[PDB]
Write a protein that binds this ligand. Structure first.
Ligand SMILES: CSC[C@H](NC(=O)Cc1ccc(O)cc1)C(=O)N[C@@H](Cc1ccccc1)[C@H](O)C(=O)N1CSC(C)(C)[C@H]1C(=O)N[C@H]1c2ccccc2C[C@H]1O
Ligand SMILES: C[C@H](CCC(=O)NCCC[N+](C)(C)CCCS(=O)(=O)[O-])[C@H]1CC[C@H]2[C@@H]3[C@H](O)C[C@@H]4C[C@H](O)CC[C@]4(C)[C@H]3C[C@H](O)[C@]12C
Length: 328
């Protein structure tokens, strides 16, 4: 019944999945990003160094290509790509639909991220009004065409050296989680954002905005909240970068607890530490960065999602959260 695209871990920090553009089935690797709402692929017309090692899109070889050519720039927090709109058949798992996407010709504003990673493009899994060009989300559009049961998708993330992951479209599969699945209502029209009380030891923020974001390989915390957490924690900031290093077994490292009237979600140090033995013996980096939004906000990124199976439900305007099964 449901369509299941396999997720591959890349250096236990990112994960990617593959999909196709064109009726000649041109293959691409995507970051799958719940926090954005446009699809893009690098073009054969790309003029920049970053495209050299990528799978490139050739509209001339697809009979289902429809020209648009409207110029567009996608601005991410990690950089900018530019190009123009094109329309073609997009295939995700076994499902296809004609889809508007961005043909990228300049990726120099997205370095060094682009050249250092093995993805080709980004496939947005956000809300329509967050898109450029008023593009209906893939999953919404697939439901509207009755190709899937429900306008929802789920993430069961891969775990480095343990199991593969899945982006599942159309339904919720019991095989991905254990214990209860708790639904948290979205608190915003166009982000996968929910309200949770956030506790880290003695520090807490009542009714914080929490964005569940598949494209962010960190937990982000308000900067003042982070500053309090790190006080007398025996961690050291990396020169010039917003990351902190610690002895891996530092017993002061706290557990994040997020609560709603419905549920309680925790994130222990094992889920947010990254070993860096090559930099030194028994050293870890915290996958936590300080970021201020206009309203106090946490991004519950990839470290959160490695622990917790997540359901993104457009029809019920909610995020479902459950403990991910350790193995399939
Ligand atoms: C609507 S369209 C995209 C939107 N535009 C904007 O907000 C407009 C904007 C542009 C520039 C700016 O100064 C501020 C604003 C954007 O970018 N939303 C992002 C989510 C986001 C949003 C706000 C804060 C943090 C992150 C997006 O969903 C996303 O996940 N991204 C952007 S590409 C990406 C898929 C590689 C990933 C990313 O960067 N990851 C790195 C990251 C990020 C943060 C911490 C550690 C690390 C490590 C890496 O994992
Ligand atoms: C989102 C905020 C922007 C704040 C702002 O806009 N003011 C900025 C400030 C510092 C930025 C990170 C660092 O640069 C290090 C690193 C470089 C990689 O290449 C891309 C990933 C990463 C983690 C960056 C992502 C993002 O871009 C951050 C969090």
């Amino acid at each position: 019944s449901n369509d299941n695209i396999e997720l591959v871990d890349f250096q236990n920090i990112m994960f990617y999945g593959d999909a196709e553009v064109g009726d000649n089935q041109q293959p691409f690797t995507f970051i799958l990003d719940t926090g954005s709402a446009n699809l893009w692929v690098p073009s054969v017309k790309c003029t920049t160094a970053g495209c050299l090692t990528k799978h490139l899109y050739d509209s001339s070889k697809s009979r289902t290509y429809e020209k648009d050519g409207t110029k567009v720039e996608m601005n991410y927090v990690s950089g900018t790509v530019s190009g123009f709109f094109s329309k073609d058949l997009v295939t995700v798992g076994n499902l296809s639909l004609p889809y508007k996407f961005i043909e990228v010709i300049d990726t120099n504003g997205f370095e060094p991220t682009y050249t250092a990673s093995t993805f080709d493009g980004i496939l947005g899994l956000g809300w329509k009004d967050l898109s450029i060009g008023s593009v209906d989300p893939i999953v919404v559009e697939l439901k509207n065409q009755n190709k899937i049961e429900n306008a929802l998708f789920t993430f069961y993330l891969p775990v480095h050296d343990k199991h593969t992951g899945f982006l599942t479209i159309g339904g919720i599969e019991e095989r991905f989680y254990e214990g209860p699945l708790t639904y948290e209502k979205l608190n915003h029209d166009l982000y996968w954002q929910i309200t949770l009380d956030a506790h880290v030891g003695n520090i807490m923020l009542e009714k914080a905005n929490c964005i569940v974001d598949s494209g962010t390989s960190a937990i982000t915390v308000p900067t003042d909240f982070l500053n309090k957490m790190l006080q007398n924690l025996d961690v050291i900031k990396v020169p010039f970068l917003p990351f902190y290093v610690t002895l891996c077994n530092n017993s002061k490292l706290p557990t994040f607890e997020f609560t709603s009237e419905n549920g309680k979600y925790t994130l222990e140090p094992e889920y947010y530490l990254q070993h860096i033995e090559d930099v030194g013996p028994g050293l870890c980096m915290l996958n936590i960065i300080g970021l201020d939004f206009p309203v106090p906000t946490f991004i519950l990124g990839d470290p959160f999602m490695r622990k917790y199976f997540t359901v993104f439900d457009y029809d019920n305007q909610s995020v479902g959260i459950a403990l991910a099964k350790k193995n399939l």
